[PDB]
Amino acid sequence: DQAGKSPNAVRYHGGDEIILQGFHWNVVREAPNDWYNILRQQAATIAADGFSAIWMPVPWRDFSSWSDGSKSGGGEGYFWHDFNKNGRYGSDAQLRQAASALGGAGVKVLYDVVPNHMNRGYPDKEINLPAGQGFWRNDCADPGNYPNDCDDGDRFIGGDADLNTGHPQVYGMFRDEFTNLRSQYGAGGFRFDFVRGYAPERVNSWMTDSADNSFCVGQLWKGPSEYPNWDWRNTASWQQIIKDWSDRAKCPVFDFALKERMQNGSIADWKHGLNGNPDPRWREVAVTFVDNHDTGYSPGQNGGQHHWALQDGLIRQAYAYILTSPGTPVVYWDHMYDWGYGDFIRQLIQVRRAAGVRADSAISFHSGYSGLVATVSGSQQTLVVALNSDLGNPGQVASGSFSEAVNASNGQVRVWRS
């Protein structure tokens, strides 16, 4: 497991990770207080499946609750009140056990951290930050969803729970928790939540301070139309917006450019996510995914959130694409372990590894066929990927001797290796 920084110092840990999103939105409801036992038990399995890292849920206990009609949620970790690890996922003891098992099996553990806000109103919690000291966004004048003097990023909904992450004392508190996660909970890196909520640069500071050489990924879900009109980003592509963030945080970023094309364009347009970028400095920072706990469904209640779900008719094509292309791929727990795509995903992980495809591998798209047709230059082998295409044989688009590596869904999914 190669573990360097990119040529631009971005913390992509070698550029060869394959990540599992270690949870779905309803886990706290479906397997209450049992999740860490489940992962401990599945540890060997996850490692054998080919994952090099697991994105764990928020470790900080969350006992929040909300309801707006038919819809209810809370306790998933995004509205935590303390750094106490005895939450809805299991005990501190179980977490440690789980992190130990995972790590033992060779799987790095990446924790989801939420620095933007906290469950301010939670009556019983270990962290109490008073009003009037500049600890809160609302300690300042808060016009709208724009940076105020107490918060250099957007706010979460109303902004009444937003922290001044830049206050020396707030910064220092997070800093110390990141170091703790690394030293006692085996953190190999972090997934930075709601990154639009605070400065990019703070993330670099935090990584530098606590886990300089670890892996990090930022979740920036904010489209061009969410920036002010005078902002260059109001008129930029989704790619530019996320790339800009990554340049400043010095961390890989979720490929929302790819996700938006998967949702709104045709398969041929998939070549427009960050990961298809002709500049390696651009595509190597992309962290690709098909669905996450927000965008996709989850077993159980209300089908989870499904804010921007990829239809089942494209799931195999979507996985085939991310698993065989540049950037760092992420697999959603549910597709892997609940819905039966596991076998299919397993095969693709093996193709990816056999080919030596990494974050900066070159990708070329071919214009004369239907669907998406790409040539990927893995370090070990060349891959020909034809999704929902009329392509006849790999030789129509690439030089070399190819063997069929994958052929699924009545040929809608075909991958050949050199």
Ligand X SMILES: OC[C@H]1O[C@H](O[C@H]2[C@H](O)[C@@H](O)[C@@H](O[C@H]3[C@H](O)[C@@H](O)[C@@H](O[C@H]4[C@H](O)[C@@H](O)[C@@H](O)O[C@@H]4CO)O[C@@H]3CO)O[C@@H]2CO)[C@H](O)[C@@H](O)[C@@H]1O
Q: What is the contact surface with ligand X in residues (CB under 6 A)? A: 64, 66, 73, 78-79, 114, 156-158, 160-161, 193-194, 219, 293-294, 305
CA nearest to 360, candidates 3, 7, 1? 7
Q: Using the rule CB under 5 A, give the single segment among 40-48, 151-159, 242-250, 377-385 that binds Ca ion.
A: 151-159
Closest distance to ligand X from the beta carbon of 193 (Å): 5
Burial of 339 (0-12, 13-18, 19+ CB in 10 A): middle
The residues in 195-214 that bind Ca ion, with binding defined as CB under 5 A, are 197
Of 256 and 416, which CB lies nearer to ligand X in the complex structure?
Answer: 256
Question: Do the beta carbons of residue 389 and residue 371 sit within 8 Å?
Answer: yes
Please, where are the H alpha helices in 217-326? 238-249, 256-264, 280-283, 315-324
- For residue 225, with 0-12 CB atoms within 10 Å meaning exposed, 13-18 middle and 19 or more buried, which class applies? exposed
For the bound state, the minimum distance from the C-beta of residue 224 to ligand X, rounded and expressed in Å, comes to 18
User: DSSP readout, 87-126?
Assistant: BTTB-HHHHHHHHHHHHHTT-EEEEEE--SB--TT-SS-S
360 interface partner picked from ligand X, Ca ion, none, CB below 5 to 8 A per type: none
Which of residues 4 and 392 has its CB atom nearest to Ca ion in the complex?
Answer: 4
Q: What is the smallest separation between the CB atom of 81 and Ca ion, expressed in angstroms?
A: 17
Q: Whose CA is closest to 108, among 379, 283, 328?
A: 328
By CB under 5 A, residue 153 contacts Ca ion: yes
Binding partner of residue 141 among Ca ion, ligand X, none, CB under 5 to 8 Å per kind? none
Q: Give the tokens for residue 120.
A: 């301010």
CB of 215 to Ca ion, least distance (A): 7
Which is closer to Ca ion, CB of 28 or CB of 161? 161
Nearest residue to Ca ion, scored by beta-carbon proximity: 14
Query: Least distance from C-beta 215 to ligand X, angstroms?
Result: 18
At position 401, the amino acid (one-letter code) is S
Q: Which stretch binds Ca ion (CB under 5 A): 110-118, 260-268, 275-283, 368-376?
A: 110-118
Closest approach, Cβ 416 to Ca ion, in A, equals 27
Using CA atoms, how far apart are residues 176 and 160, in angstroms rounded to an integer? 24
CB of 114 to Ca ion, least distance (A): 11
Instruction: Report what 114 binds from ligand X, Ca ion, none; CB cut-off 5-8 Å by kind.
Output: ligand X
Nearer to ligand X, 116 or 381 (CB): 116
In the bound complex, what is the minimum distance in angstroms from residue 293's beta carbon to ligand X? Answer: 6
C-beta closer to ligand X: residue 79 or 174: 79
Say if strands 382-387 and 413-417 run parallel, antiparallel, or are unpaired.
Answer: antiparallel
The residue (of 38 and 207) whose beta carbon lies closer to Ca ion is 207
Nearer to ligand X, 78 or 297 (CB): 78
If one asks whether residue 87 binds Ca ion (CB under 5 A), the answer comes out as no
Site for Ca ion in 156-175 (CB under 5 A): 162
CB under 5 to 8 A by kind: which of ligand X, Ca ion, none does 157 bind?
A: ligand X
Helix axes 342-355, 35-49, angle to 10 degrees: 50
* Cross-strand pairs, 328: 287
Write down how long the chain is: 418
CB of 65 to ligand X, least distance (A): 7
Chosen residue from 49, 139, 151, 284 binding Ca ion by CB under 5 A: 151
Amino acid letter, 57: P
| C-beta separation of 167 from 52 below 8 A | no
Residues 228, 236 contacting (CB under 8 angstroms): no
Residue reference for tokens 């902004």: 159
Q: How far is the CB of 76 from ligand X (least distance, A)?
A: 6
For the beta carbon of residue 352, count every other beta carbon within 10 angstroms: 24
Neighbours of 392 (CB within 10 A): 10
Our finding on whether 188 is near Ca ion (CB under 5 A) is no
Residue 147, interface with Ca ion (CB under 5 A)? no
Residue 50 interacts, among Ca ion, ligand X, none and using kind-specific CB cut-offs from 5 to 8 Å, with none
Report the residue number, 72 or 133, with the smaller CB distance to Ca ion.
133
| Closer residue to ligand X in complex, CB, 66/146 | 66
What φ, ψ does residue 410 adopt, rounded to 5°? 55, 40
Cα maximum dimension of the chain: 70
**Is the CB of 153 or the CB of 304 nearer to Ca ion?**
153
Which one, of 314, 359, 344, lies nearest residue 415 by Cα?
Answer: 344
Applying CB under 5 A, which residues contact Ca ion?
1, 13-14, 16-17, 116, 151, 153, 162, 197
